[PDB]
Each structure stands twice: as structure tokens, then as C-alpha cells.
């Protein structure tokens, strides 16, 4: 219930997805020492890191392939100018 409302508020449709209710540790020592991280949280943290690294990997790969294409166009255009420089017309043209 209320999944559509949560999506409009920037939250997940399932409250168990993320947020304070899920990500926060479930317990801590009475002395005050924080509890060791839960197994589910460690799995999510590793899973999110892999997603984050893929985002960086894909974003840098497109920029590298976009700069490379621009350099080929710059190199190709320069080749046209070089061939016309070494020619001196004569005869009728002079």
C-alpha cells in the first residue's frame, strides 16, 4: 500500500528498499559500542559499489571514445592541406 505515493516523494515504493528503516543497524551494545555490520548491509554496500564503479567506467569510456573520434577528424582534415602545399602549377596557369 502507498507505493505510488512513495515514488512521488523520492522514496522507494517498498519501504524495505532503502532509507533509515532498513539501512540503519538494528541493534547496538548497551555499553554504546556499535554492532558489527549486518550481512544484508554488507551485501548492499558491495553491490552499490559495483554499480558506482560501472557508472564511472561507462562514463569515462564514452568520453574517451568521443575525444578519440574528434582527434581522428582533426588528423584527417590536416592531411588535406599538406598535399596541396607541394604543388607549383605552371604552363597555361603559371
Amino acid at each position: 500500500a502507498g507505493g505510488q505515493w512513495r515514488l512521488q516523494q523520492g522514496l522507494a515504493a517498498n519501504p524495505s528498499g532503502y532509507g533509515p528503516l532498513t539501512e540503519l543497524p538494528d541493534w547496538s551494545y548497551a555499553d554504546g559500542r556499535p554492532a558489527p555490520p549486518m550481512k544484508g548491509q554488507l551485501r548492499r554496500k558491495a553491490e552499490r559499489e559495483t554499480f558506482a564503479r560501472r557508472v564511472v567506467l561507462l562514463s569515462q569510456e564514452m568520453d574517451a571514445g568521443l575525444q578519440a573520434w574528434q582527434l581522428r577528424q582533426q588528423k584527417l582534415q590536416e592531411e588535406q592541406r599538406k598535399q596541396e602545399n607541394a604543388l607549383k602549377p605552371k604552363g597555361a596557369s603559371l
Partner: protein, 122 residues
């Protein structure tokens, strides 16, 4: 006979009235996709099942990030009825090496680099 479907190129041409409804920008296209499978590959042709595996969409409701390039879009145009496509938004920018462990993909498509799980003081 039932065969593969060729989607006309006219379909994938955004109209001026579409940009004011979804908030996209033709002059500054989004760099990455957020593809999420929301439909079962069961009762679908085998070539649609193969593409789902190629896109890493085996598990449903599991967001995956793909590059907004024609070759990848070509596979998306085949299984566009089984997936949900959303642009990846980076209000804080790309994650850094010190932010890899603090990222979180929200349902709005934004990938924040500071996940504190704390109410806004504002």
C-alpha cells in the same frame, strides 16, 4: 507467421510536445540509461530472451546502467516492451574514489554520492 518486428525509425523521433512532458533535452542528451526489467521473458520469443541476458537483466526490478549509444539502443528497441528506461541523473557529479562506498541510486534516477541516512537539518 510470427517473426521479428521492425520498428519504424519515425517512432524514435521525439516531438516538440514530448520534451515538455518528460523533461528531456535533445541538445544535451543523457549519457547513461537505467534499464529495469518489469516484465517476464516467459511467453516471449527466444531472441527477446537472449537480449535480456546480454543486457544483464536476468533479475526483475534490478536497475542496470547502460550507455546511451546506438548499438546498445538497438538492443533496447527490441525488448522495449519488457524494460523501463530512465536517464541517470548526477546532481553531485560522478562518484569519486572516496565516494564509491557512499553512493545510492534513488527511485528518481539520481545517483547521490553522500548517503548519510539522516533527516535534513533545513
Amino acid at each position: 507467421k510470427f517473426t521479428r518486428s521492425r520498428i519504424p525509425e519515425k517512432v524514435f523521433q521525439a516531438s516538440p510536445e514530448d520534451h515538455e512532458k518528460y523533461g528531456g533535452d535533445p541538445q544535451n542528451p543523457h549519457k547513461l540509461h537505467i534499464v529495469t526489467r518489469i516484465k517476464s521473458t516467459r511467453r516471449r520469443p527466444y531472441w527477446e530472451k537472449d537480449i535480456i541476458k546480454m543486457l544483464g537483466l536476468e533479475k526483475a526490478h534490478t536497475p542496470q546502467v547502460h550507455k546511451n549509444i546506438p548499438s546498445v539502443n538497438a538492443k533496447l528497441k527490441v525488448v522495449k516492451h519488457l524494460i523501463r528506461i530512465k536517464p541517470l541523473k548526477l546532481p553531485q557529479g560522478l562518484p569519486a574514489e572516496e565516494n564509491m562506498s557512499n553512493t545510492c541510486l534513488k527511485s528518481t534516477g539520481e545517483l547521490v554520492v553522500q548517503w548519510h541516512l539522516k533527516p535534513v537539518e533545513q
